[PDB]
Amino acid sequence: RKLALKTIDWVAFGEIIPRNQKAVANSLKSWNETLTSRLATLPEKPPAIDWAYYKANVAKAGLVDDFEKKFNALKVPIPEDKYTAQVDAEEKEDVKSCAEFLTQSKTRIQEYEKELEKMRN
Amino acid sequence: EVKNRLDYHISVQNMMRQKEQEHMINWVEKRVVQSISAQQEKETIAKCIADLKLLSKK
């Protein structure tokens, strides 16, 4: 699994941070790189094993057979996470960017320019 | 996790074929090694080939 996408908006990412986390970004930035290169090279997908021959030369076939079935039916689940309220704290900090900043900032800019004619002059 | 399973079996059977070779080798060599001379004709077949050496060598 995990068809991954690469760096999107990397110009915006690195170049502009929350001051209160600015350090973190570097740490997270470099962490990402680690994950990137590692995954790109190795995905976890093995073969499914040639039993037929193996049974021949694992003459303990009953073993081969029993283990064989249990494996082939076997399922490994989706391994666990630890962040998924982050998913949400995004939109919340995202409100702060936009709305919180959209509106408040938008008003500021409007007046300034509205003044600018007189003072531009 | 699977392969480890299988390889243990293989490796025993492989080793068992060699151990059967070593034990069979010792046993066959210990079984057949006796009445050789009781066939004096195994020195006749030497004499055989030896007259066919001393003839068929020149």
Curated annotation (Swiss-Prot), chain A:
It comes from the Eukaryota. It comes from Bos taurus. Component of the ATP synthase complex composed at least of ATP5F1A/subunit alpha, ATP5F1B/subunit beta, ATP5MC1/subunit c (homooctomer), MT-ATP6/subunit a, MT-ATP8/subunit 8, ATP5ME/subunit e, ATP5MF/subunit f, ATP5MG/subunit g, ATP5MK/subunit k, ATP5MJ/subunit j, ATP5F1C/subunit gamma, ATP5F1D/subunit delta, ATP5F1E/subunit epsilon, ATP5PF/subunit F6, ATP5PB/subunit b, ATP5PD/subunit d, ATP5PO/subunit OSCP. The keyword DNA damage does not apply. The modification N6-succinyllysine is found at K75, K82, K92. This is ATP synthase peripheral stalk subunit d, mitochondrial. Coiled coil: none annotated. The modification N6-acetyllysine is found at K29, K45, K60, K69, K75, K82, K92, K114.
Swiss-Prot record, chain B:
It comes from the Eukaryota. The modification N6-acetyllysine is found at K30, K42, K53. Signal peptide: none annotated. Transmembrane segments: none annotated. Component of the ATP synthase complex composed at least of ATP5F1A/subunit alpha, ATP5F1B/subunit beta, ATP5MC1/subunit c (homooctomer), MT-ATP6/subunit a, MT-ATP8/subunit 8, ATP5ME/subunit e, ATP5MF/subunit f, ATP5MG/subunit g, ATP5MK/subunit k, ATP5MJ/subunit j, ATP5F1C/subunit gamma, ATP5F1D/subunit delta, ATP5F1E/subunit epsilon, ATP5PF/subunit F6, ATP5PB/subunit b, ATP5PD/subunit d, ATP5PO/subunit OSCP. Belongs to the eukaryotic ATPase B chain family. Subunit b, of the mitochondrial membrane ATP synthase complex (F(1)F(0) ATP synthase or Complex V) that produces ATP from ADP in the presence of a proton gradient across the membrane which is generated by electron transport complexes of the respiratory chain. ATP synthase complex consist of a soluble F(1) head domain - the catalytic core - and a membrane F(1) domain - the membrane proton channel. These two domains are linked by a central stalk rotating inside the F(1) region and a stationary peripheral stalk. This is ATP synthase peripheral stalk subunit b, mitochondrial. The chain holds residues 192 to 249 of 256 of the full protein.
